[PDB]
Amino acid sequence: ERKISDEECPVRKSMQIFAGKWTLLIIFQINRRIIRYGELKRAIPGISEKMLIDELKFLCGKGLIKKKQYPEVPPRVEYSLTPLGEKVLPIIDEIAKFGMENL
Amino acid sequence: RKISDEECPVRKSMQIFAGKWTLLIIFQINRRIIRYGELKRAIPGISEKMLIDELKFLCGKGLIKKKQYPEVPPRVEYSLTPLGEKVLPIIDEIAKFGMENL
Numbered sequence: 001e002r003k004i005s006d007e008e009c010p011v012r013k014s015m016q017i018f019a020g021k022w023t024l025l026i027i028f029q030i031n032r033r034i035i036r037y038g039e040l041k042r043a044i045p046g047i048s049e050k051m052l053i054d055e056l057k058f059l060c061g062k063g064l065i066k067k068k069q070y071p072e073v074p075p076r077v078e079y080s081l082t083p084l085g086e087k088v089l090p091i092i093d094e095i096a097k098f099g100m101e102n103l
Numbered sequence: 104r105k106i107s108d109e110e111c112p113v114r115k116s117m118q119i120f121a122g123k124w125t126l127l128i129i130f131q132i133n134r135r136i137i138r139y140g141e142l143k144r145a146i147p148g149i150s151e152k153m154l155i156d157e158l159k160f161l162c163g164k165g166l167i168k169k170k171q172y173p174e175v176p177p178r179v180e181y182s183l184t185p186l187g188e189k190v191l192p193i194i195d196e197i198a199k200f201g202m203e204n205l
Contacts, residue, residue, distance in 0.1 A: 010201025099112025
């Protein structure tokens with residue numbers, strides 16, 4: 001007998017954000033640095049352009065990553081983690097550990 | 104630093120954990136034994152098809168054990184394998200994120 005996972009469950013709430021096949025990997029790649037869009041895309045080979053920018057939009061909307069605009073020649077977007085997004089890194093540490101030990 | 108290619112431990116893990124339901128199911132089975140029907144009720148809004156495909160996926164990935172009892176009335180029970188129990192520290196961090204920020 002354990003508490004059920006209704007729409008209030010803290011794990012179920014979290015999986016609304018993190019359920020993507022790319023969400024946590026993007027956060028993993030950004031990490032504690034500033035990364036250009038192009039570097040980010042090359043840091044996750046196989047992710048399509050569409051899957052990257054919908055996911056980048058999603059994460060901005062959730063306040064997990066921040067976007068810096070540079071309207072210069074040539075122009076660029078830079079992404080970094082917010083303090084909220086930084087709170088996801090402990091989850092990712094544990095995922096990395098699982099992978100390295102078991103896969 | 105290190106790119107998320109085929110040799111990336113995070114990328115490898117997300118092949119398994121990407122589901123809407125995967126981590127929720129592991130979380131609900133947890134360190135006990137649970138019948139299909141109890142587990143179905145423990146995650147409201149999951150369809151029969153979703154739960155069955157996911158259970159089969161998790162068995163295939165060696166994360167949960169299925170045990171049939173061909174008796175009257177019949178039952179399937181699920182528990183975590185030792186590999187599955189190693190997913191619980193991930194889920195603890197997710198639960199922590201959920202209650203603190205959501």
